[PDB]
Design a protein around this nucleic acid. Structure first.
Lengths: 80, 94, 98, 111, 98, 80, 110, 94
DNA sequence: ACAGGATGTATATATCTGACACGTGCCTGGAGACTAGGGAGTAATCCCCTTGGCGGTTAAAACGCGGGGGACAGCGCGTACGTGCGTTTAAGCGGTGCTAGAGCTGTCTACGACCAATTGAGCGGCCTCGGCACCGGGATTCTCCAG
DNA sequence: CTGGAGAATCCCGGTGCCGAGGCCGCTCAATTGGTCGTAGACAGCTCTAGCACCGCTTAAACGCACGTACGCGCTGTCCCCCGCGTTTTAACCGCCAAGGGGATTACTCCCTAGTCTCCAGGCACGTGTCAGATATATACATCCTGT
């Protein structure tokens, strides 16, 4: 897989901003948002894959994701 | 096979106690289950730290009460302390 | 003469729409591909439960919505109504994410 | 051999949350080498009270949404509308919960 | 005519002075009295180790210095050099105090 | 023991801002800083007093303050 | 006749106490059992982190023309090293001060 | 009198092996002791959670390794993993 | 853009001075040795459930365009804040004394672990009906241009 | 300051469908009951240090006066983003199929708890002595007014 960060499209980022109560959006916001989302996703996935490797597993479970999230202070309800 | 475990029946009992004609979905039930597990872990960890600080090898109702009034804010902590105290006093009699 | 709402009113209408709603605002398949690409950067030929990718998407959307709330606060603080990358950078710097 | 009829500890404490299950979890969680008899009772009471608060507020959020079933959106609305509950769960994200509807005053039309 | 420095230059020199040093910038006795007054409502006839008041002062000064750094960033964001209460409010709101 | 928040003087807040790299300070900054300092101190002291009362002591120790800070994600080094 | 005692720190080539770390692991009730290699691994990690921060702090002390590490030097070492700063970004060093930095907009105009 | 515990002599040994002609103040030594205690508590708690997640009752060197690479960032994590693995190998070798 | 005048700040030496680093004596807590038992590693199996592909529908994304309204640069002004000085105030230092309470220390008792038998609470599975999602049609409200 | 067209939104009424909730069987985990060991509560003694006070010095706070430069309001201009229509595209849904590996069970072995004895590593204490503040004097380093 490659260049899949472009799958996070401009209208999707606009919708996320609208949920954040953003009225007007600069043109440079979308690339910045893709970068910050990539950084956040990299951190969470790195911790989750570390949890997966500790269990000698080859499948990343939802438990790994929620443990990774609550490790970053982003504790998530609804998946265990 | 296996056998899982959750607070689903207890959360449902409390819901029927506080809202008799209100249901709850599986996603909301899972969120309540995660909430109960999270608050349990927070209170138990703070009580464990209290017992370790005070060089105590047992977690008592005092450790749980202090952990509750540390983690919970304001009126939430006050009412939680009242509920825990009344439950302990009711359990000791019976 | 075609009808045209003034710039901003449609933006406010979709602000109300996406704050009232609760569904995921990112397409599922592109996000899943992004997640798998990052994971393959970390560990080769991984596998994901559907709930794992769903939890990742819920967390990422919550993080981005909160970040955009802080960014909007930063933009309004500068007597602006348009969010700019400087607003995102200031919000992340104050949050400590930088 | 005249064993008395078993009474669950939650019933003795007058609770709905399981005192025995909480006691086992406290023992197995490596919090201390010993767990008092009143510790699971107190912890179960606190958990039940917090669950009751959240469920009451979420049922209220379902009432004015004219829904007879609690969904994650109702839990999110209840938690973020209550200042104390929001403070308790400030770092917690609720899946399929959405956000509170609020728009900044400067973004509204100027008239 | 007496020699005078232009506004902001001795301010910069004491910025350098107070970022070069490490001592506590709040007077010890007023802060200790403030700590005892705040603690008196939680519990009466309460006592403090001297190291406890020192730790409280160190933590409070570190917190206030960090908050002033974030406030300065907020003021610069609004194209100003004067920090204002709105800047402290924005910094605390983004950090999570509000 | 009253009105000891005014003991946090305007020059003291000015020095704190100078260490924070603040060149120019508005006149209303000082009352706001006193308010935020009061809130922070109330939180930390409340937690420290709770720790002290759980130990059945009546002197707030340095360790109580350190634990109170560490609970709030503001761990302090140099006091135990 | 017992053999000559050898500390597990010496057996692992470490300065930090493997025995004390093992006892603290078994007494902090992190788990009901603690492996043999877990205390030596943890002691190695702690000793490495101590070595890193002390190396940087001693370099700061040398740059400050002082032969004794003080809290200021530890603060400079932690805040200048971005990984060490990320590890200790939520901790405050007592008597450490702050990094000397002024925003460029505040510098004199001309 | 009493009997207290600290990492002061170990921090001093590491300092001497990393900076022979350099001392350390009492306050700096106390800060280093607090740092060692804090990192020990962080790593041990993360390893405890790792063991509890996988339904394990023992904390081994691999739990500590996973906790270290979960807690330390970037080059610190890999260098600490290298140091721990080297220490464990040369400890089991003797 | 350059003198020079003035104030501030790194250098450069004496000079005590506590704090540091090192030496000692204990003593308690690691280390050597050995035993038992259960946790976990490994192997086998099985069956979720994850991945991959295909095809149709269409919702959403991408693109283009017109324009308006918001970002931003520039200007003016007036007031708030920085700077400096004389005055006041209370912090800080250094004592002194005293006593409240932290810190062991020994007894013992009540409370929590542990073991065995028992049973009923709770979980897995099945089933069903009604709450809510969907769809279609007014009713209503808000927007925006044109007056 | 409204009138009216237009578009979005809300209220309502009728299918329908799938998941929330109730029922049932089983089983394993909570109860009960009884015992034993030790954790801590509890009284008591000690001696540390926290509190309170006093006086003197002087650093710091404070109040005032002045001027300046910065915040903020206003204006212009301009171009960037928003609203909208059209075309494209790939997301989504449904279905199928295969096999990877999660996950459950059985066996055994080896690794850790627990003990007992023993000794030496580390801590409390004591003590020289030397980085290191701390006063000088000095040599620039900038700041700012003036030309």
């Amino acid at each position: 897989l490659r260049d899949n960060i472009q799958g996070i499209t401009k209208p999707a980022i606009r919708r996320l901003a609208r949920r954040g109560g953003v009225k007007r959006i600069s043109g440079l916001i979308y690339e910045e948002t893709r970068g910050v989302l990539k950084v956040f996703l990299e951190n969470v996935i790195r911790d989750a894959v570390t949890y997966t490797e500790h269990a000698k597993r080859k499948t990343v479970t939802a438990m790994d994701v929620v443990y990774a999230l609550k490790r970053q202070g982003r504790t998530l309800y609804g998946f265990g | 096979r296996s056998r899982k475990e959750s607070y689903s029946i207890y959360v449902y009992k409390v819901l029927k106690q506080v809202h008799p004609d209100t249901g709850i979905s599986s996603k909301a039930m899972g969120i309540m289950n995660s909430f109960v597990n999270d608050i349990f872990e927070r209170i138990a960890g703070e009580a464990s730290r209290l017992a370790h600080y005070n060089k105590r090898s047992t977690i008592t109702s005092r450790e749980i009460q202090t952990a509750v009034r540390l983690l919970l804010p304001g009126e939430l902590a006050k009412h939680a302390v009242s509920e825990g105290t009344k439950a302990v006093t009711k359990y000791t009699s019976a | 003469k075609p009808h045209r709402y003034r710039p901003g009113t449609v933006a406010l209408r979709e602000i109300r729409r996406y704050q009232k709603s609760t569904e995921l605002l990112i397409r599922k398949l592109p996000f899943q591909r992004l997640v798998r690409e990052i994971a393959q950067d970390f560990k080769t030929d991984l596998r994901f439960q559907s709930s794992a990718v769903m939890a990742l998407q819920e967390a990422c959307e919550a993080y981005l919505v909160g970040l955009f709330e802080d960014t909007n606060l930063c933009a309004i603080h500068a007597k602006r109504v348009t969010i700019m990358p400087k607003d995102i950078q200031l919000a992340r710097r104050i949050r400590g994410e930088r | 051999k005249a064993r008395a009829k078993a009474k669950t500890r939650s019933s003795r404490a007058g609770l709905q949350f399981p005192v025995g299950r909480v006691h086992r979890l406290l023992r197995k969680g490596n919090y201390a080498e010993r767990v008092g008899a009143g510790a699971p009772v107190y912890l179960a009471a606190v958990l039940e009270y917090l669950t009751a608060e959240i469920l009451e507020l979420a049922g209220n959020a379902a009432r004015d949404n004219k829904k007879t079933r609690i969904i994650p959106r109702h839990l999110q609305l209840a938690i973020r509308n209550d200042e104390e509950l929001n403070k308790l769960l400030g770092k917690v994200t609720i899946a399929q919960g959405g956000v509170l509807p609020n728009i900044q005053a400067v973004l509204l039309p100027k008239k």
